[PDB]
Design a protein around this ligand. Structure first.
Ligand code: NA
Length: 121
């Protein structure tokens, strides 16, 4: 149907917009702390602590399958990256502090993304 096609074009355009958001967020992580999954071969105890691991490569795989239906879903995954890091790592660490700075800088990007998603429909 044409109605199905139109819904598909919309998911594609959301995907485009979320790609540009993901790129802008990931620029705020020049150390690439959040680029890849925590390896269970180097933090063997990770999954005892963190139930839903998340990282930018994992988000990118989902995005490329058009797996985010709305900005809320994408934000949930970004928040997991930050929140997981702030739990596993202590306040005094480079990791915890990198998550704080990512959250702060990412807020700006997501504020405007919400306006664009709402505005364009
Ligand atoms: Na903690």
């Amino acid at each position: 149907s044409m109605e199905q096609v139109a819904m598909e074009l919309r998911l594609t355009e959301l995907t485009r917009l979320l790609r540009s958001v993901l790129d802008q967020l990931q620029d705020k992580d020049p150390a690439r702390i959040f680029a890849q999954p925590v390896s269970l071969k180097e933090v063997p105890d990770y999954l005892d602590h963190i139930k839903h691991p998340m990282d930018f490569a994992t988000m990118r795989k989902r995005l490329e399958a058009q797996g985010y239906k709305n900005l809320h879903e994408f934000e949930e995954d970004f928040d997991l990256i930050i929140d997981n890091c702030m739990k596993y790592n202590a306040r005094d660490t480079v990791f915890y502090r990198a998550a704080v700075r990512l959250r702060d800088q990412g807020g700006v990007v997501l504020r405007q993304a919400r306006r664009e998603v709402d505005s364009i429909g």
